[PDB]
Nucleic acid binder design. Structure first.
Length: 289
DNA sequence: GGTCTAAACGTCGTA
DNA sequence: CAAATGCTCCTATACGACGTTTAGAC
DNA sequence: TAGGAGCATTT
């Protein structure tokens, strides 16, 4: 059975909290307002959603161009809020969550059926995700956006949180560089990486502290990068062996481990072994069918 | 000087 | 009835993931 | 992915 913190970490990576405000003649305010919580991933990972569904006893699963689990009814969203109240997010999405949570309450209490409550909801939405559209700005001018929590000083709550987060945002890849100064003509590097927009760096340094390795690379986005071979060998691999990666990325992880094994035994320093590794790499990640 | 590891630096396409 | 929400389709860019060059240990 | 918008159906 999946851990709640794994769920929170994974949602921390890939999930979305949303508020839809659509023009509607039938409403007294002229507008329809509704809250949503959703996770999308890839058809190949429908099983992950089922585990979440199995955990919560709630959520609607769909599969088409992608795989999604959604929470749209008040009871289900109530379940979601109860969960994150018990097992809180630690990325910036917590702030979105908090905006979402305020709106939900406004909606739960039917205060959204007033001009006042509707306007307040828009103040919440303005700071939520992408904020208010041009159309909504046009329809509701002089809207002042609700204050948004800057999330800071947050501790890693649990190793399984890390497993879920890495299952969302992490990457295990093999870097091959053409380089004449090597006998094989190529440098081979095993790389572990986590990518995130420039906003949770306090958190990122904390992941470095928690795993006790890696460096920060800044490009709009920040990367946590582990390249040290026996940091990978003596820190990362035991960690994810105990704290399991979920989804197809688990398989990519396994292949990555295998190549790390080959590298440790210096097989990357031979032509045949280099061909082997190239062959494995070609079957990893995006090249996986 | 040769070989190598680590990582700083560069950057494209679809999920 | 209109309020809630079931259900489906649309858009495009934060992402993952792939490549090269440099500092420097041995 | 991430976030989005809106018609159809149920309550």
């Amino acid at each position: 059975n999946i851990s709640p913190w794994t769920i929170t970490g994974f949602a921390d990576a890939d999930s979305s909290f949303m508020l839809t405000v659509s023009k509607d003649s039938k409403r007294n305010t002229g507008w329809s307002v509704r809250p949503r919580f959703r996770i999308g991933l890839h058809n190949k990972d429908v099983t992950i959603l089922k585990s979440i569904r199995e955990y919560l006893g709630a959520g609607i699963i769909t599969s088409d161009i992608d795989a999604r689990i959604r929470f749209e009814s008040l009871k289900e969203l109530e379940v979601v809020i109860n969960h994150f109240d018990k097992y809180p997010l630690i990325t910036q999405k917590r702030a979105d969550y908090l905006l979402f949570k305020k709106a939900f309450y406004l909606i739960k209490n039917k205060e959204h059926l007033t001009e006042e409550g509707l306007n307040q909801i828009l103040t919440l939405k303005a700071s939520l995700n992408l904020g208010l559209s041009e159309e909504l700005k046009e329809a509701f001018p002089n809207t002042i956006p609700a204050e948004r929590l800057l999330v800071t000083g947050q501790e890693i709550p649990d190793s399984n949180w890390v497993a879920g987060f890495t299952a969302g945002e992490g990457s295990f890849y093999i870097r091959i560089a053409k380089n004449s100064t090597l006998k094989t003509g190529y440098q081979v590097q095993s790389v572990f990486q986590i990518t995130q927009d420039t906003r949770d760096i306090e958190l990122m340094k904390n992941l470095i502290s928690y795993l006790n390795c890696g460096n920060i690379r800044i490009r709009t986005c920040v990367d946590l990068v582990v390249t040290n071979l026996n940091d990978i060998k003596e820190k990362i691999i035991p960690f994810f062996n105990k704290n399991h990666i979920i989804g197809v990325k688990l398989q990519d992880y396994r292949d990555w481990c295998k190549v790390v094994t080959l590298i440790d035994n210096k097989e990357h320093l031979t032509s045949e072994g280099l061909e082997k590794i190239q062959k494995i790499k070609e079957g990893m990640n995006r090249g996986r069918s």
